[PDB]
Amino acid sequence: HMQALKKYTIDLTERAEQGKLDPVIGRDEEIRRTIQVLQRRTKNNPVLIGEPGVGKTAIVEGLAQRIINGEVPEGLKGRRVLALDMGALVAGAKYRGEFEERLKGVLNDLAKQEGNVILFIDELHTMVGAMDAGNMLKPALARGELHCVGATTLDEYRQYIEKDAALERRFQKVFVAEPSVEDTIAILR
């Protein structure tokens, strides 16, 4: 069971449990905000907004680390953070139809783990119009069968999410600015 999740997602909370995630520096406020949005009853899917290379994915890894560390509110305790693996979804698929079938499987598995998994979808706009899985994502989001964190640029969010109420009512912008040079080089060992 949950074959789609094992095949097409990367368990970031597991990577944290294994000590494989780099410490995340200078993002206390963005991680806290991401958590606050996720905890909402409605419009509870945060979308990290920023230019490429600003480190949005690191914020998601930071969220995973905090959960493992228990540095999160009570209801988020024991939650799993899974990143949609686009490379894996496309590997050996060849056709859009096969890709869609695999994505559908992922959503089905998530509908069974409602409230236990947070899915991270990088470059979210590419899944809703920028290969449009909007039809399956919209009801999943509305029914709480999909609780996720997305990442895009402001212009991409405006063009593909903000103009579509079925999507916009479910997402919340969380801005991410470029990190300081100091914090960027701090990751080196």
Going by the annotation, the residues of the binding site for ATP are: 50-57
Q: What's the CA gap between 158 and 34, in Å, rounded?
A: 19
Question: In the structure encoding, which two tokens stand for residue 146, read together?
Answer: 């999909």
Please report how close the Cβ of residue 56 comes to Mg ion at its closest, in angstroms. Answer: 4
Rounded to whole angstroms, the Cα distance separating 120 from 148 reads 6
| Token code pair at residue 176 | 């991410």
Smallest distance from Mg ion to CB 81, Å = 16
Number of residues that bind Mg ion (CB under 5 A): 1
Q: Using the rule CB under 5 A, give the single segment among 36-44, 54-62, 84-92, 111-119 that binds Mg ion.
A: 54-62
Question: Could you tell me the two tokens for 150?
Answer: 């997305």
Nearest to 124 by CA among 61, 171, 79: 171
Could you tell me the end-to-end alpha-carbon distance of the chain, in angstroms, rounded to an integer?
40
Q: Which is nearer to Mg ion, 87 or 92 (CB)?
A: 87
With contacts defined by CB under 5 A, name the span among 41-49, 51-59, 83-91, 99-107 that binds Mg ion: 51-59
Q: Is 56 in the site for Mg ion (CB under 5 A)?
A: yes
Nearer to Mg ion, 165 or 177 (CB): 177
Summarize as ranges the residues that interact with Mg ion (CB under 5 A): 56
